[PDB]
Design a protein around this ligand. Structure first.
Ligand SMILES: [Fe+3]
Ligand SMILES: [Fe+3]
Lengths: 440, 440
C-alpha cells in the first residue's frame, strides 16, 4: 500500500538553519519534485566505500542558501553519479525486521537499505517520526545502542541524512536517515564508543578540553601512525580501529560534558573541527581543506538542530555531542593527525571570495558545480557563528568570531572552478598528498 | 646489500610479442630510466580496491608498440595517479619469510608488497628467476598452490606483472610479479579453483566447449544475479563467490584441456574473451568495451608467453590456461553475464580508426592519453591474430580472422579522446550503466 510517509512535501516558510535570503519563487516546487524523485528512484549507496548519495544534502543545502529552481536542478545534475537504482524490497524481510533480533542481524549490510527504508516508512506511518527516532536511537535497547554507533559511520553521513529529515520535519527523509543508519557497513567504531563511554562513566578519568585531546592524538605515535595513507576509505576500520582502538578510546574518554554543558560542548566540538580545517596548512602551499575535517564541520549543524528538539531528552543530546567529539579524534588520527596552527586562518587572505559578505558567498556557492559539500560547509559555518555568538577565541576555543567566515572563504577559494577530485585534500597529515598541491 | 636483481635493464633488441615497428632511437634508454624509477620509488598498490600500479605495463606495452621516448614519458606521466611511495621494508620480516609457515601467514596483505619484493629479489639473487618462479608457483607446496590462485587475483594483475617480467626476462620485474602475487588481497577465488579442479579430475564431469559455459553462466539465474552492480570492485568476493561459488565451480569444472590441447585452449580462452568484449553491445548505443572483459583479453598474451617457456612443464602451461578460462566465467558473471552476439563485431564500422592498419593503429595508441589498458588490449589482439593464424570462426571459436583487428579498432574508437573514467563500461550486463552511454 502507498504510505503518506513516502510523500516528501516541504511546505511553509521554514527554510533551514543559517538561512539568509529566501529562495526566489518556483524553487520550493522544484525542491519538492527533485526530493521525491531522489527518494523513490535512487539507492543510498552507489559504491561499497565513500558511496553515500548526497542528492538530498545538496538540494536542501542549496535551498537553505536561497538557490533558485535552476540552482537546485544544477545540484541534482551534479550528483548524477550518486544516483543509482534503489534496491528491490523483499516484503518478507520487511515484516521480519519488527523482530529486534532479526533487525540487529541484518544491520551493517549496504544491500538492506531499501528493506530498512520500507520498514521505517511503515513504522513512521503507524507511530510518527519522533516516536520511531526515540525508539531506534535513544531508548537504549540493544538495537538502539547499535544504531547510535552506526549514526556516526562513514564520516557522519547517517547523522547528516537523519539531521536534514529532523531539520525540515520530513517523515520520509527521517526514514531515509534511519535506513542509512541501519544499513551502513561497520568501521569497528561501536567498540570504540562503548570503551570510551565505559571509561568516562567509571569515575577514574578526569575530563580535559577537546583541543588538548587532539594534541594527545598527534603526540602519541602509536595513534598518530595507526592509519596508512593508501588505506584510503578504510583508514578508520583497518588502521585507527585495527591498531589503536583501546589507545584512542582512553584519549576520547577524557571528553566529558556536564549536565549544563550542552551548548558549550557543541561550540567546542564545532570550533575544534573548524580549527582542524583551517589550521592543517603547510608553508609554501596554497590553502586546502581536508575532506574528512570538512565532514566534522558539515555534521556539526545537525548537533545544533538535534539540541533544539523538544521530543529529545537533554541527557541524549549531551550523549550525541560526546560521541561526536570523540569520533572527531578518530577522523583526526585517520588524516595522520596534522600539526594545527591558528596563524593559518588568522593570516589567510581571501582570493575569489575577497570582499564578499555571507549573502554574496551564499549566492556564489548556489551556482558553483559541486556535489553539495561546499553548500554544506558554508551553511554549517554561518550557523556556527550564530551558535557561538559572543564567544571569542581562548585556550579551549581555537576558532571564533571572524574565523567562521574566514574558513567559509577558504573553502570557497580552495575548491571553486576545480573538478570534484581536486577540491579537498584526502588526509592533510600525509606529506605525499601535498606534493600534488600547488606551491604559492 | 645492493642486489644485481634490483637493477632492471633491457638490452638486446627483443621488443615484445606482437611488436611491428621498432621504437626510434632514444626510446630504450628512456624505458630503462623510467622502469627503474618506478621499481625503486613506487608501491604496487595505491588504494585498497582496483589499486594496481600499471606504470610497468604502460611503459613496456608502449615500447612494444614502437613508441618514442616522448610516448614513454607520456605513459609515465599518465600513470602519476598510480605512483605512491613504496612501503618501508622490515628486514626482520624478510628474514622470517624463509619459513614456509610465516610466508603463508603473511600473504594476502597489500602492505607486505615491499617485504615480499625484497625477499624475492634476495631469492632470485641466490637461485635465478626461473628456479624461484618454479619454487613459488609450480612446485605444488602449500605456499605454491596458494600463490597459483593469487596469480589470477584482481582481474589478472599479478599474472600480467609476472608475465611482463618473464616476457622481457627481467629478474627484478619477475620479483615485482611474485611480490604482487603474495601480497594481493583475497577475493575467495582459491576455493573456486580447488573445487573446479577437483570436479574436473574426478571423472564425474564431461568436458564442454568454453562458449557453452559462458551460456550456462548466463542461463543459470543463481550465478548470473549473484553479483550486484553497486558491489563495484568486490562483486567477485561478495557476490559471485559469496553467493554462487559451488554453482559456478561446477560449471567451470567442464572446461578441461587434453594433453595435446594447450595451443587450441589458448585460442579458445582468448577468442571467448574477445567475443565478450565485442559481443556485449546494445541496440541504439555506441560501442563500449567492458573494463573486466578487457582484462580477460589483456592477460591472454601472458598465457601465450608462459606457453613458450622451456623451463615450465606442458602440464603446468595447460593448468594455467584451464584456471584462466575458468576464472573468465567468474568475471563474465561479475558483469551480470550480458547477452553476446557475433553480429556486433561483424557489422562494426570503425570511426576514428577507419582505414588504419595495425602499424597506424599502434602509432595512434602510442600517443593517446591512457593508463596503459589501450596499449595492452591492442597488443594482445595483434598477438592473438598470430597465435590463431589459420583458425576461422566456428561454433566453439566465436572471434577469429578479421575479428581481432576489428575489436582493436572498437577499443580505440570507444576510448580515444575520453577521460579515463569514461573509457570502459564497468559491467556490460547492468542495464543501468548503458543509460550513461551515448545513443547512436
Ligand atoms: Fe559527504
Ligand atoms: Fe588493469
Amino acid at each position: 500500500t502507498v504510505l503518506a510517509t513516502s510523500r516528501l512535501h516541504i511546505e511553509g516558510d521554514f527554510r533551514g538553519y543559517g538561512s539568509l535570503d529566501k529562495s526566489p519563487p518556483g524553487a520550493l516546487e522544484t525542491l519538492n519534485r527533485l526530493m521525491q524523485n531522489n527518494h523513490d528512484e535512487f539507492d543510498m549507496f552507489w559504491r561499497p566505500d565513500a558511496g553515500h548519495n548526497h542528492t538530498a544534502h545538496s538540494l536542501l543545502s542549496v535551498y537553505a542558501l536561497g538557490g533558485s529552481s535552476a540552482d537546485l536542478e544544477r545540484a541534482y545534475r551534479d550528483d548524477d553519479p550518486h544516483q543509482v537504482p534503489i534496491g528491490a524490497v523483499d516484503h518478507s524481510v520487511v515484516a521480519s525486521l519488527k523482530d529486534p533480533r532479526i533487525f540487529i542481524h541484518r544491520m551493517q549490510r549496504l544491500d538492506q537499505y531499501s528493506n530498512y527504508l520500507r520498514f521505517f516508512e511503515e513504522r513512521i506511518e503507524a507511530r510518527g517520526w519522533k516516536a520511531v527516532v526515540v525508539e531506534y536511537l535513544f531508548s537504549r535497547s540493544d538495537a538502539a545502542e547499535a544504531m547510535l554507533g552506526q549514526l556516526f559511520e562513514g564520516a557522519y553521513h547517517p547523522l547528516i541524512q537523519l539531521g536534514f529529515g529532523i531539520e525540515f520535519e520530513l517523515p520520509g527523509l527521517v526514514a531515509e536517515g534511519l535506513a542509512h543508519c541501519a544499513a551502513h557497513d561497520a568501521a569497528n567504531i561501536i567498540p570504540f564508543f562503548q570503551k570510551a563511554e565505559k571509561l568516562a562513566k567509571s569515575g577514574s578519568v578526569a575530563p580535559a578540553p577537546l583541543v588538548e585531546l587532539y594534541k594527545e592524538v598527534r603526540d602519541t605515535e602509536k595513534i598518530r601512525l595507526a592509519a596508512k595513507m593508501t588505506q584510503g576509505p578504510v583508514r578508520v576500520r583497518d588502521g585507527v580501529m585495527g591498531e589503536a582502538q583501546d589507545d584512542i578510546a582512553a584519549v576520547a574518554a577524557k571528553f566529558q560534558v556536564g549536565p549544563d554543558g550542552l551548548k558549550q560542548a557543541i561550540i567546542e566540538t564545532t570550533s575544534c573541527a573548524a580549527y582542524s580545517c583551517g589550521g592543517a596548512q603547510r608553508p609554501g602551499k596554497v590553502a586546502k581543506v581536508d575532506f574528512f575535517f570538512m565532514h566534522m564541520v558539515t555534521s556539526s549543524i545537525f548537533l545544533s538542530i538535534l539540541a533544539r528538539q523538544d521530543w529529545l531528552e537533554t541527557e541524549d543530546k549531551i550523549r550525541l555531542v560526546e560521541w561526536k567529539g570523540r569520533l572527531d579524534l578518530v577522523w583526526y588520527a585517520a588524516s595522520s593527525a596534522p600539526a594545527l596552527d591558528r596563524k593559518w586562518l588568522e593570516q589567510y587572505q581571501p582570493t575569489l571570495s575577497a570582499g564578499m559578505d555571507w549573502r554574496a558567498l551564499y549566492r556564489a556557492v548556489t551556482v558553483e558545480p559541486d556535489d553539495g559539500h561546499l553548500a554544506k560547509i558554508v551553511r554549517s559555518l554561518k550557523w556556527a557563528e550564530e551558535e557561538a555568538k559572543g564567544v571569542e577565541t581562548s585556550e579551549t576555543i581555537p576558532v571564533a568570531g571572524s574565523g567562521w567566515f574566514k574558513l567559509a572563504q577558504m573553502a570557497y577559494d580552495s575548491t571553486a572552478h576545480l573538478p570534484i577530485p581536486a577540491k579537498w585534500i584526502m588526509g592533510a597529515g600525509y606529506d605525499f598528498l601535498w606534493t600534488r598541491v600547488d606551491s604559492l
